[PDB]
Write a protein that binds this ligand. Sequence first.
Ligand code: CA
Ligand code: CA
Ligand code: MG
Length: 333
Amino acid sequence: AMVNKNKEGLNIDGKEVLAGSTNYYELTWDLDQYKGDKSSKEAIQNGFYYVDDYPEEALDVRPDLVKVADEKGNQVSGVSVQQYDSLEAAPKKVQDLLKKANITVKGAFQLFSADNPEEFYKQYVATGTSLVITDPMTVKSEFGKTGGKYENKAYQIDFGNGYATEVVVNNVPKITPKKDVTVSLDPTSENLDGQTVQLYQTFNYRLIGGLIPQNHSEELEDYSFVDDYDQAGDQYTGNYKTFSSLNLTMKDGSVIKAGTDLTSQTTAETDATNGIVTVRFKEDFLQKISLDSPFQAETYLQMRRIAIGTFENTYVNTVNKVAYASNTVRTTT
Ligand SMILES: [Ca+2]
Ligand SMILES: [Ca+2]
Ligand SMILES: [Mg+2]
């Protein structure tokens, strides 16, 4: 058995996992088969190992969180974990172990081993004490821009033979903020990116957040719009509105329809010196969104064009404090 869980222990097999989130994998190390009639000599001679072929393209292991315990949570000492970048890179003894076990791995993997086979056998195997490996791995923050599926595979090795656990699959959503320029709050209004904005005119920067898909694995703690605008051409008026981009289902079962004004569920911080405005969703509002609901929102910053020339703007949508830059717009005055 292998399962993936979020930090609060919720099973998240098959779920969408945001860049920066952690997969708290739990691998079951089943020692039940030793209640059979093979000898301790056969068990100890072969040793006790577990292999995790983790998806190194998507995930970074958190070795500081790797732990081995029994089913009651008693921590188990004497199990070591070694990470290897590839099979070729691993020592001959490890290569041979996997070969004999009928295992192949893709790229990097981890090997868990009983440091002291005889004592492992006496204290854990012979007492019918199965173990639980906690093996957390974080989605690379970068990956959130390309997105894609990843798969974690594990194998237990007993009497020198490897047996696969289940494979757990997850997906990383591509988070792709977009920035438009408008003179209206209507979502169908014309995008002025690439066009002219007259001197002294009021206009909006439309900051469309990334789409958090339904069936996501972690609470939303942060969903912010950060806009360091060019003060040589633009002045933020101190007025903005934020709207839902989609229907949102809340944990209680209520629904906020697409296009609802969510400005009262946000706060804004403005830096007048540097020409930066940051609009954040209130944490208590984000907590109300169901994990099964998609989430997306957009913010219209009301601006004034205060000088002639060509000016660009880009914004950053942070999602659980991970930054995703929008496209860069350009207007001429
Ligand atoms: Ca791998
Ligand atoms: Ca600025
Ligand atoms: Mg070598």
